[PDB]
Amino acid sequence: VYRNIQACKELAQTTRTAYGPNGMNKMVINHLEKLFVTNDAATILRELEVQHPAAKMIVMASHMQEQEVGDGTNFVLVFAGALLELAEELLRIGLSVSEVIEGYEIACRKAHEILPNLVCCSAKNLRDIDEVSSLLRTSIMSKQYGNEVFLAKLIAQACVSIFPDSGHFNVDNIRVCKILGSGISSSSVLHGMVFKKETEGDVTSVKDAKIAVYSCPFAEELMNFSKGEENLMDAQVKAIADTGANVVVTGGKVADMALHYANKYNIMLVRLNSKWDLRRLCKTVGATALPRLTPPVLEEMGHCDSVYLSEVGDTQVVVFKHEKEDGAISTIVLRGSTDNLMDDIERAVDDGVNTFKVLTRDKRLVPGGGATEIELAKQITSYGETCPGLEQYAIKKFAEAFEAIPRALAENSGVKANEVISKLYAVHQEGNKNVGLDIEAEVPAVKDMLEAGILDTYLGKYWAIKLATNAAVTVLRVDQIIM
Amino acid sequence: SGRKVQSGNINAAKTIADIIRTCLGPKSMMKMLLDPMGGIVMTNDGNAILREIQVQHPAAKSMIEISRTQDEEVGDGTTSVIILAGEMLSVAEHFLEQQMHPTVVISAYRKALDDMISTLKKISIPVDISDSDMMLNIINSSITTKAISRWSSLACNIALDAVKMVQFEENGRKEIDIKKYARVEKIPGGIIEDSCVLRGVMINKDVTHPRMRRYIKNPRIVLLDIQQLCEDIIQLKPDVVITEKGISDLAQHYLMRANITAIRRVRKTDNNRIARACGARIVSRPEELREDDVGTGAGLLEIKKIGDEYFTFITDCKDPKACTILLRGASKEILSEVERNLQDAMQVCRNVLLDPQLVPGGGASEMAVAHALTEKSKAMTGVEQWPYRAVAQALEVIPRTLIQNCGASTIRLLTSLRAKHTQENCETWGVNGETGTLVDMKELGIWEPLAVKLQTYKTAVETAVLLLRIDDIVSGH
Amino acid sequence: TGETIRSQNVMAAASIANIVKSSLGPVGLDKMLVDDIGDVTITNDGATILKLLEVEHPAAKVLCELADLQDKEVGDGTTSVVIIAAELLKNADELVKQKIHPTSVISGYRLACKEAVRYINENLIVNTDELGRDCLINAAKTSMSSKIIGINGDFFANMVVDAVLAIKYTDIRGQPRYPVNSVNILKAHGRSQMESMLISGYALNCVVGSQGMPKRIVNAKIACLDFSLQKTKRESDITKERIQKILATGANVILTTGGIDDMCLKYFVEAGAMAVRRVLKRDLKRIAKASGATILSTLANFEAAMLGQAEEVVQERICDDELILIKNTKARTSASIILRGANDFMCDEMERSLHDALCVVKRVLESKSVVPGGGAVEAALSIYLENYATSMGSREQLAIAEFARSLLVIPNTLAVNAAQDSTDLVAKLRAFHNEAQVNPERKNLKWIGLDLSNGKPRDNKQAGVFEPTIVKVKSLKFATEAAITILRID
Amino acid sequence: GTDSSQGIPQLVSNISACQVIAEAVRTTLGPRGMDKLIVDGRGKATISNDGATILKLLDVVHPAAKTLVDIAKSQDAEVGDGTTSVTLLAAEFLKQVKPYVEEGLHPQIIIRAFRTATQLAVNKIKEIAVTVKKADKVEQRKLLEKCAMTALSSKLISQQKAFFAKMVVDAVMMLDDLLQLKMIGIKKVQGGALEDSQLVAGVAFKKTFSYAGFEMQPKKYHNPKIALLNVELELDYQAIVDAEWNILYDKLEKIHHSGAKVVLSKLPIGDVATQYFADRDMFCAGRVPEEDLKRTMMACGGSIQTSVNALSADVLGRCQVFEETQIGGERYNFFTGCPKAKTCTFILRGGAEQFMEETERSLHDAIMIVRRAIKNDSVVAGGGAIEMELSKYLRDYSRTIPGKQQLLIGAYAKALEIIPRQLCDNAGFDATNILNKLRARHAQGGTWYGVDINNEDIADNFEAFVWEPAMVRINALTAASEAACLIVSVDETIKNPRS
Ligand SMILES: Nc1ncnc2c1ncn2[C@@H]1O[C@H](COP(=O)(O)OP(=O)(O)O)[C@@H](O)[C@H]1O
């Protein structure tokens, strides 16, 4: 039993250092020898060889937390490790393993109703670009560097604010065309599906287009074989060019007589598609995957509207746009020098836009950064002495676990945790809810979080304090496996 | 090194505490010790365990040493100080693992100490002065669950007369009591009812040829440590002059010429009690031999052959501060325990002379200071808050060990006890040491006196701050 | 393995300071000092820790005597002269590993200490003058901080600086001396410490000699003795004839340290004298030297003029205590604050806080040239010797900075022992002493040091936290003397 | 036997790993840096003094070393030289911040202090930046020739380096379209004195057996161009000889029909068949380098061919003139006279063989220095004077700021000082005197006192025209700080093997 919660403690400790906006990034040289200098907990959890079975419940609860808000994973891990760390103290006091379960359940049910009573929600809409750019600041502020978020919150928001329309949203439409080279300031916004191409013979102002679909990319007897191959690729590009295609796509490289054919019929020779856009370009234009050059027809065809060349990001790229939604797809172009920061920027983008998605359905915003956690830590520990019996222990061991969350925010910022926790707990008694932990001060100084703007989603905390408690309870109710 | 050997200090202090943890209270489990020779000895008394036991660590030695200073002042409870220091020292390391200094910990411990000395005086119930019924209740609380329960009916009187004959009116009204002037004489032979009290000092020794002008109706005792000086004495003419060496019968007649009675082979616990009961003095230098020579002492000398023994009673004395208590019987195993527990009770009724307060023990005083310090912990902020609260709940092992060694569970019992102590503020309930049930200790009657438990709590806090003050033992191992 | 015996000596000398590091300052911890005979030792000061330590390494044994050479000058500073010299060895070994010769580091240290004392002698204080008194007031308030005297301790501070300066002895060379046992503790039962007052003499709480002496018996000639004036049977019957032989010589206030005279109060209206039992020698000798008297065990013999001067012996009630008012004497060895309270036991730590204030006030009085406390001299010197080092350009240039980086260990230690983080306090002292140099208008910003009780930046010239300049100067001399020897040893 | 995978052991292992890879490139800093020899393993001896030429050919096994060698790879893509300086500076940042970490200070604090110190330094470098453009550098160009003189000043080569300075300013000025190392090659010629060198306006290549066919080609020709062929030219048992004879016939007739002056190929032509492929009736060439392939197509413009009688429009199209001359005795290829002339090749006419190494160490940065002094004008001094001024500024900024960063910014300060300390150690002087006498008059007199590489005494590199580009130093110390805080921010390295 104690070995299980010890495995949960070390699983909490390996992600506690990567918590908050000053998370220490870890190095991943994985099974197939990657190289990630990364900070997101779901990236590390999907790489770590979780061998102990009791920690797999914690990993699965964090994965379920990822599956519906996209964030709050490290919060679930830290809170569950804190609950089990205080649970072993409760067990070594002399409480049963049953009593801690319903104590945690009662205090979690109390937290689930105290949590909507501290909200400072969003103002009017997920429109008004400059208002919701500040609302998306906290997500990438936690992940990437804070001084970088001032451009990055705008770049991540002005593209995602294209379609906050008719009460429905999709996060898959926000893509990234990862283009290397110039700095992060050179990043820009694009409206439609974008990737680089090679050639130039593009008809631009097309109607509802006719898109080629590729699921698989590319003495006189010698001259006769040459003419045979010549008319062979001619009939091949005609087998696409019949039924009137405007573009010819391929995942690979150019061919010289084939590009002369694509200039002869005036077709855009699209090249160099990824091993992931083969589904995504089919999804956006209504295309069905075709292996070779011979078997397209008019029924076997995609339908964009405007395919031409753009030079934003200082590089020639394609554009696919104006679908049934007429603005369904809206990628972003992310410019960096190397790749080892660009994966973190990419994993910050979607973790910003899923918070935008949960803001479509939950406008409630709680003050984050120690404000909510110390408030719950005070409320439940004031509830704890009210109900007598053995649960009076366990409820008081619940809210104290909430104090482990700003402590992990404290010690990740070079701050003495006991001083800042005592100071925050004292100032929360009178200078109420909206105060929390300041990051920038080396001195353990508190700061009001509402005027700082550092607020989190209410539904994320609401689901996270449910799933972490469920994980801790379902871990505490096992004894062993023969192993 | 440093905090590592500080943790080693508190570990070496805690291990000797859990050695003697279970053996407090009236249901004490017996700790057995073997030598590397074959001596197999079982006991309950914690001090008896502390005497033989060796410790390889100087921190544990000093922790033992301050309790060794504690034993000879107010008496027992020396297991309680070694217990109650250890939990504070163990709970201090949880903040020493929080990278906070020993200084904030010991200042929080001192801030708990000044609270604990006050809150015990809040819950102090006044016993009345020298009223024999609650004086019997003092015997009922302090002297029972021992081997005196068939002979405490005499010990209740032996307490009450001895405390009234060891008083000292130095700065005020009779305030200092003492246990070294009460003239105990524990001789076997006869029934234990022959153990009697009287005013004065008995002396086992006598002159070897008692054809002397020996007993005079107002013996004025001069001490000495020569017939020319015997001639020189007769300026003021005292009637007795005390030596310690042998007096021949010719020298006895020559002292009869002076009319003074000397004495031989007398002990020093005899001699200082002789001088204490009478106000003796000593001088033989002739220009210091003045009006200031003779200590006007007793009102009766008495050659008495008590138990065929050459007794001399210096009784009806000057100062009622060294007075007779005989101790008779068959063997010498229980009136020694009577003497021990009644010198502890002598300090008890010394407290009754000064602060006559009987606070409910059995952890009820401990639960009261615990609750009254937890509620005071709610207002205070700063880093010293958590250690200050820690000794709020580190010290409650006095019920927790006592509920441990009586069969009942500790968890539900202590949780229900604090449940009937926090919101039930004016109750002061304690765990009964027999059935393991939460009773009103005021209804049960087991009241520990205030000053002795104040001394134990203070000495425990001093032990804690002494150990945490220690940094390193670098002069050897 | 093992190499560079200089580094072996550096580690051996560094271990000695690592023992006595956390003991620096009044909030220092305790070092258990145990030989295997069984005995323990509980002590906080580096002097006896350095003395009774069974020291092992021979190169480290060069330290304990050189710091003992600090002991025979002023006493304390023995810990700091170990700590500073060990940090000098630590930085000097790092300089040695950069192929800088130990001769060059030693010559740089020898330039640095002379430049440091030249910097110190242009920035010390003599402001604690005859009219500079409130500095002594809050300097006494430093000795009684965080105590319950603090609301009456200003009223105590006025009377205690009036105690020490009025009792002051102009010595044989003219410099003022304070005998510490001259003014002494003296309890009074009854009302609390709100009313305790300095009396300009001693006033003994023993048996009353006489009301027969007048309210100001103008020439109190102290005919003190040791006998008890009791009759036996120019006297053998020792009550009168010796004291009458000296009494015709103008013996004004007879004192009998033993018993009283039998015809006492009748001789006490023609002489105006006393007979007080148990006159302790703390007050008997310090009324003898207060007046210039002679105590006569035997008296049969001159004895006219050597019964020294006092001006009046008052017979009144002082806080439920008629006292023996040996007061207004020839020399000022007679003063006592009548400690009103219950005993010397209810105000025991209170009279401790009243006595230690005297001996911490006396330190600035001897050798009136003074520097601030709180380690601010070391912070100012680290500011100083940095820019002094950057002017050199020789091979000693890296030495003096390693001098200046070493000296700030004394605020670095005191920040640790006062339960603070050691970085920010020393950094704040360095920042505050920057504008003591780089800003010409704020020259009155030098005196910011660490408070030894809390560990925070705080003025010391305004607060009285001071140190005699010869202590700082000679400790900085002897630290370099300890550094140069062990750096030469290889 | 030492196990180090906990957090403080993690960072200690990481900084030992950066220290060893810094020692792998420590001695190569500066113009006269010590050479390092590595092999491939099979006998391909490579002596190098460059950093990335060492570092790419080096091995790297460690995680933190791999996540700094990427920054090292990023620094060579700008200009090349300077990759050792940024890595050595970041390693000295880590070695100076070393004793503060295990004493108990937080890595995010020292990272933030590094960032603030970097922002302060990149501020202070901008104010001391001096432009030198209109002080007669392109018109009356001789002062820009003067910094062209800074490559080999006051040597026995310096008299010939007057001609080399004039020709390097010509090799920059005549071709400035953001010039590269590719557009200007150097060609070694044995024999003669070093003064007899040249800078030709075109390509230059020695001809060997498999290289080129026969002399007496149309040298003085109005428009001599190139066929760029990828087919060979060289020479059933009765039905296999006549087909080869016919192929010989049509490949002979291709030269008449297509009209190619010199056919170019990556395929061998027979010089044992010299007149036999002069019986191709024209010149040809084979086994071509890629610099010849570019600089005669991107600059001259010779078209590329495919078949038996492959005619094109640029086998005798517009180039200026052909040349084939005994330069130093040996006749060389010259498809000189390029209409798109980003091609002027240096012709190292000289006696000794290892002076090729001397010129490819000394004039391979002189092209960079001169084309940068044209490209950048806001420049600063070198020789470690700029790091010394930033170290003085940040030494002031440390003690004038309260808080724990004061010890770190000074740690940011002294860590700069190994940049000239490694320089003089690569020169040979004592670092201690050359640093102390530097810092004294640097803190008293002025800023741009720097370390001279020749006499090893403190000089004024601003007056010796030793210009360092301000933007290059900005990117250098920015990348040094970034590679510092990346390794400092790294604690955990999760492995998760195969098995
Ligand atoms: N600048 C900041 N100031 C205060 N708190 C912050 C800041 N940035 C992030 N946080 C807090 O860190 C907490 C954890 O976020 P994190 O777990 O890193 O998100 P994710 O689960 O997407 O990685 C959030 O609840 C947020 O309140």
PDB file of N, CA and C in Angstrom, chain B residues 58 61 65 101 103-104 171 234-236 285-292 466 469-476, chain C residues 19 22 28-35 38 40 42 53-54 227-228 230-233 238 242 343 345 416-417 419:
ATOM      1  N   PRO B  58      25.840  12.088  23.780  1.00  0.00           N
ATOM      2  CA  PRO B  58      25.879  13.084  24.864  1.00  0.00           C
ATOM      3  C   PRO B  58      24.618  13.913  24.970  1.00  0.00           C
ATOM      4  N   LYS B  61      22.492  12.131  27.186  1.00  0.00           N
ATOM      5  CA  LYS B  61      23.056  12.273  28.523  1.00  0.00           C
ATOM      6  C   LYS B  61      22.590  13.563  29.180  1.00  0.00           C
ATOM      7  N   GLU B  65      20.270  14.372  32.311  1.00  0.00           N
ATOM      8  CA  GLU B  65      20.866  15.113  33.421  1.00  0.00           C
ATOM      9  C   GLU B  65      19.934  16.196  33.951  1.00  0.00           C
ATOM     10  N   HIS B 101      14.789  27.930  10.245  1.00  0.00           N
ATOM     11  CA  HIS B 101      15.883  27.918  11.196  1.00  0.00           C
ATOM     12  C   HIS B 101      15.453  27.282  12.513  1.00  0.00           C
ATOM     13  N   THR B 103      16.025  28.897  15.138  1.00  0.00           N
ATOM     14  CA  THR B 103      15.739  30.077  15.950  1.00  0.00           C
ATOM     15  C   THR B 103      14.250  30.397  15.978  1.00  0.00           C
ATOM     16  N   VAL B 104      13.588  30.346  14.819  1.00  0.00           N
ATOM     17  CA  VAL B 104      12.151  30.577  14.790  1.00  0.00           C
ATOM     18  C   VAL B 104      11.401  29.462  15.505  1.00  0.00           C
ATOM     19  N   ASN B 171      11.321  35.482  53.521  1.00  0.00           N
ATOM     20  CA  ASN B 171      10.819  36.690  52.880  1.00  0.00           C
ATOM     21  C   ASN B 171       9.369  36.991  53.228  1.00  0.00           C
ATOM     22  N   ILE B 234      32.915  29.637  80.525  1.00  0.00           N
ATOM     23  CA  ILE B 234      32.069  29.914  81.688  1.00  0.00           C
ATOM     24  C   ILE B 234      31.925  31.429  81.903  1.00  0.00           C
ATOM     25  N   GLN B 235      32.325  32.215  80.906  1.00  0.00           N
ATOM     26  CA  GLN B 235      31.938  33.621  80.862  1.00  0.00           C
ATOM     27  C   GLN B 235      30.418  33.784  80.778  1.00  0.00           C
ATOM     28  N   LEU B 236      29.772  33.161  79.787  1.00  0.00           N
ATOM     29  CA  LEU B 236      28.324  33.311  79.649  1.00  0.00           C
ATOM     30  C   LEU B 236      27.580  32.127  80.256  1.00  0.00           C
ATOM     31  N   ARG B 285      37.381  31.337  69.068  1.00  0.00           N
ATOM     32  CA  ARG B 285      38.399  32.382  69.058  1.00  0.00           C
ATOM     33  C   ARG B 285      38.076  33.416  70.132  1.00  0.00           C
ATOM     34  N   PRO B 286      39.021  33.730  71.030  1.00  0.00           N
ATOM     35  CA  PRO B 286      38.655  34.434  72.277  1.00  0.00           C
ATOM     36  C   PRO B 286      38.195  35.872  72.092  1.00  0.00           C
ATOM     37  N   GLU B 287      38.750  36.612  71.130  1.00  0.00           N
ATOM     38  CA  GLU B 287      38.230  37.951  70.876  1.00  0.00           C
ATOM     39  C   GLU B 287      36.977  37.931  70.013  1.00  0.00           C
ATOM     40  N   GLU B 288      36.670  36.798  69.382  1.00  0.00           N
ATOM     41  CA  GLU B 288      35.340  36.565  68.839  1.00  0.00           C
ATOM     42  C   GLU B 288      34.427  35.882  69.847  1.00  0.00           C
ATOM     43  N   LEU B 289      34.995  35.262  70.882  1.00  0.00           N
ATOM     44  CA  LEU B 289      34.213  34.770  72.013  1.00  0.00           C
ATOM     45  C   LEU B 289      33.702  35.979  72.788  1.00  0.00           C
ATOM     46  N   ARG B 290      32.407  36.242  72.658  1.00  0.00           N
ATOM     47  CA  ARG B 290      31.776  37.482  73.096  1.00  0.00           C
ATOM     48  C   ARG B 290      30.389  37.132  73.625  1.00  0.00           C
ATOM     49  N   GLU B 291      29.492  38.121  73.647  1.00  0.00           N
ATOM     50  CA  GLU B 291      28.072  37.846  73.858  1.00  0.00           C
ATOM     51  C   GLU B 291      27.472  36.988  72.741  1.00  0.00           C
ATOM     52  N   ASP B 292      28.109  36.938  71.573  1.00  0.00           N
ATOM     53  CA  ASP B 292      27.587  36.277  70.377  1.00  0.00           C
ATOM     54  C   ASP B 292      28.047  34.831  70.257  1.00  0.00           C
ATOM     55  N   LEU B 466      17.163  23.497  24.637  1.00  0.00           N
ATOM     56  CA  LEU B 466      18.555  23.138  24.860  1.00  0.00           C
ATOM     57  C   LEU B 466      19.058  22.225  23.758  1.00  0.00           C
ATOM     58  N   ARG B 469      19.253  24.131  20.537  1.00  0.00           N
ATOM     59  CA  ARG B 469      20.352  25.087  20.585  1.00  0.00           C
ATOM     60  C   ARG B 469      21.677  24.431  20.213  1.00  0.00           C
ATOM     61  N   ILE B 470      21.796  23.118  20.422  1.00  0.00           N
ATOM     62  CA  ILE B 470      23.034  22.403  20.129  1.00  0.00           C
ATOM     63  C   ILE B 470      23.223  22.302  18.623  1.00  0.00           C
ATOM     64  N   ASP B 471      24.417  22.660  18.149  1.00  0.00           N
ATOM     65  CA  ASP B 471      24.738  22.578  16.732  1.00  0.00           C
ATOM     66  C   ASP B 471      25.527  21.326  16.370  1.00  0.00           C
ATOM     67  N   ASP B 472      26.651  21.073  17.040  1.00  0.00           N
ATOM     68  CA  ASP B 472      27.518  19.956  16.679  1.00  0.00           C
ATOM     69  C   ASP B 472      28.363  19.563  17.884  1.00  0.00           C
ATOM     70  N   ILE B 473      28.861  18.326  17.850  1.00  0.00           N
ATOM     71  CA  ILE B 473      29.529  17.694  18.984  1.00  0.00           C
ATOM     72  C   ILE B 473      30.989  17.485  18.586  1.00  0.00           C
ATOM     73  N   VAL B 474      31.550  18.441  17.855  1.00  0.00           N
ATOM     74  CA  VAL B 474      32.894  18.245  17.326  1.00  0.00           C
ATOM     75  C   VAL B 474      33.971  18.549  18.369  1.00  0.00           C
ATOM     76  N   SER B 475      34.222  17.573  19.242  1.00  0.00           N
ATOM     77  CA  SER B 475      35.416  17.551  20.080  1.00  0.00           C
ATOM     78  C   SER B 475      35.932  16.130  20.259  1.00  0.00           C
ATOM     79  N   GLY B 476      35.588  15.235  19.339  1.00  0.00           N
ATOM     80  CA  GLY B 476      35.800  13.813  19.513  1.00  0.00           C
ATOM     81  C   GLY B 476      35.097  13.037  18.418  1.00  0.00           C
TER      82      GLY B 476
ATOM     83  N   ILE C  19      33.614  25.434  12.403  1.00  0.00           N
ATOM     84  CA  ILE C  19      33.107  25.180  13.745  1.00  0.00           C
ATOM     85  C   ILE C  19      32.490  26.447  14.326  1.00  0.00           C
ATOM     86  N   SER C  22      28.696  29.685  13.073  1.00  0.00           N
ATOM     87  CA  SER C  22      27.338  29.961  13.517  1.00  0.00           C
ATOM     88  C   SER C  22      27.275  30.483  14.946  1.00  0.00           C
ATOM     89  N   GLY C  28      23.813  33.476  18.343  1.00  0.00           N
ATOM     90  CA  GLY C  28      24.481  32.279  17.885  1.00  0.00           C
ATOM     91  C   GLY C  28      24.066  31.042  18.656  1.00  0.00           C
ATOM     92  N   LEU C  29      24.289  29.893  18.029  1.00  0.00           N
ATOM     93  CA  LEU C  29      23.844  28.624  18.585  1.00  0.00           C
ATOM     94  C   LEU C  29      24.891  28.093  19.560  1.00  0.00           C
ATOM     95  N   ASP C  30      24.695  26.866  20.027  1.00  0.00           N
ATOM     96  CA  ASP C  30      25.573  26.247  21.006  1.00  0.00           C
ATOM     97  C   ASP C  30      26.374  25.136  20.352  1.00  0.00           C
ATOM     98  N   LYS C  31      27.655  25.065  20.687  1.00  0.00           N
ATOM     99  CA  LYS C  31      28.541  24.033  20.175  1.00  0.00           C
ATOM    100  C   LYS C  31      28.842  23.054  21.295  1.00  0.00           C
ATOM    101  N   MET C  32      28.373  21.820  21.138  1.00  0.00           N
ATOM    102  CA  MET C  32      28.618  20.767  22.110  1.00  0.00           C
ATOM    103  C   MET C  32      30.083  20.368  22.017  1.00  0.00           C
ATOM    104  N   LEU C  33      30.752  20.329  23.159  1.00  0.00           N
ATOM    105  CA  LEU C  33      32.198  20.168  23.224  1.00  0.00           C
ATOM    106  C   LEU C  33      32.451  19.020  24.196  1.00  0.00           C
ATOM    107  N   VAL C  34      32.644  17.826  23.644  1.00  0.00           N
ATOM    108  CA  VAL C  34      32.626  16.585  24.403  1.00  0.00           C
ATOM    109  C   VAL C  34      33.914  15.830  24.130  1.00  0.00           C
ATOM    110  N   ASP C  35      34.702  15.622  25.174  1.00  0.00           N
ATOM    111  CA  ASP C  35      35.734  14.602  25.159  1.00  0.00           C
ATOM    112  C   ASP C  35      35.137  13.297  25.669  1.00  0.00           C
ATOM    113  N   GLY C  38      33.338  11.682  29.106  1.00  0.00           N
ATOM    114  CA  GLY C  38      31.938  11.775  29.464  1.00  0.00           C
ATOM    115  C   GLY C  38      31.422  13.184  29.639  1.00  0.00           C
ATOM    116  N   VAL C  40      30.384  17.101  29.052  1.00  0.00           N
ATOM    117  CA  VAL C  40      29.819  17.913  27.988  1.00  0.00           C
ATOM    118  C   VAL C  40      30.079  19.379  28.309  1.00  0.00           C
ATOM    119  N   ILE C  42      28.426  23.321  27.197  1.00  0.00           N
ATOM    120  CA  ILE C  42      27.383  24.085  26.527  1.00  0.00           C
ATOM    121  C   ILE C  42      27.811  25.544  26.521  1.00  0.00           C
ATOM    122  N   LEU C  53      38.846  23.403  22.617  1.00  0.00           N
ATOM    123  CA  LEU C  53      38.792  22.445  21.523  1.00  0.00           C
ATOM    124  C   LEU C  53      40.078  21.639  21.451  1.00  0.00           C
ATOM    125  N   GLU C  54      39.935  20.317  21.415  1.00  0.00           N
ATOM    126  CA  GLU C  54      41.062  19.420  21.178  1.00  0.00           C
ATOM    127  C   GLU C  54      41.391  19.501  19.692  1.00  0.00           C
ATOM    128  N   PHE C 227      35.044  44.364  63.562  1.00  0.00           N
ATOM    129  CA  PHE C 227      34.628  43.697  64.787  1.00  0.00           C
ATOM    130  C   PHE C 227      33.128  43.822  65.017  1.00  0.00           C
ATOM    131  N   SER C 228      32.642  42.988  65.928  1.00  0.00           N
ATOM    132  CA  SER C 228      31.335  43.152  66.541  1.00  0.00           C
ATOM    133  C   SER C 228      31.533  43.822  67.892  1.00  0.00           C
ATOM    134  N   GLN C 230      30.739  44.030  70.945  1.00  0.00           N
ATOM    135  CA  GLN C 230      30.083  43.299  72.018  1.00  0.00           C
ATOM    136  C   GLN C 230      31.036  43.170  73.200  1.00  0.00           C
ATOM    137  N   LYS C 231      30.486  43.288  74.407  1.00  0.00           N
ATOM    138  CA  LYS C 231      31.290  43.373  75.620  1.00  0.00           C
ATOM    139  C   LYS C 231      31.792  42.002  76.058  1.00  0.00           C
ATOM    140  N   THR C 232      33.085  41.922  76.371  1.00  0.00           N
ATOM    141  CA  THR C 232      33.634  40.775  77.079  1.00  0.00           C
ATOM    142  C   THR C 232      33.847  41.173  78.536  1.00  0.00           C
ATOM    143  N   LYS C 233      34.508  40.304  79.291  1.00  0.00           N
ATOM    144  CA  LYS C 233      34.792  40.579  80.695  1.00  0.00           C
ATOM    145  C   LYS C 233      36.004  39.795  81.185  1.00  0.00           C
ATOM    146  N   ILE C 238      35.153  44.819  74.250  1.00  0.00           N
ATOM    147  CA  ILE C 238      35.311  45.586  73.004  1.00  0.00           C
ATOM    148  C   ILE C 238      33.943  46.150  72.637  1.00  0.00           C
ATOM    149  N   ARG C 242      38.063  51.523  72.305  1.00  0.00           N
ATOM    150  CA  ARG C 242      38.709  51.677  71.006  1.00  0.00           C
ATOM    151  C   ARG C 242      37.974  52.706  70.157  1.00  0.00           C
ATOM    152  N   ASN C 343      11.393  41.571  44.696  1.00  0.00           N
ATOM    153  CA  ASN C 343      12.642  41.009  45.184  1.00  0.00           C
ATOM    154  C   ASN C 343      13.737  41.410  44.205  1.00  0.00           C
ATOM    155  N   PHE C 345      14.283  38.783  42.469  1.00  0.00           N
ATOM    156  CA  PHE C 345      13.873  37.562  41.786  1.00  0.00           C
ATOM    157  C   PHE C 345      12.665  37.754  40.886  1.00  0.00           C
ATOM    158  N   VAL C 416      22.867  34.814   8.647  1.00  0.00           N
ATOM    159  CA  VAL C 416      22.475  33.419   8.816  1.00  0.00           C
ATOM    160  C   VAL C 416      21.995  33.175  10.239  1.00  0.00           C
ATOM    161  N   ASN C 417      22.747  33.677  11.220  1.00  0.00           N
ATOM    162  CA  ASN C 417      22.448  33.392  12.619  1.00  0.00           C
ATOM    163  C   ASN C 417      21.186  34.099  13.093  1.00  0.00           C
ATOM    164  N   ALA C 419      18.453  34.123  11.488  1.00  0.00           N
ATOM    165  CA  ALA C 419      17.370  33.416  10.791  1.00  0.00           C
ATOM    166  C   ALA C 419      16.882  34.176   9.558  1.00  0.00           C
TER     167      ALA C 419
END
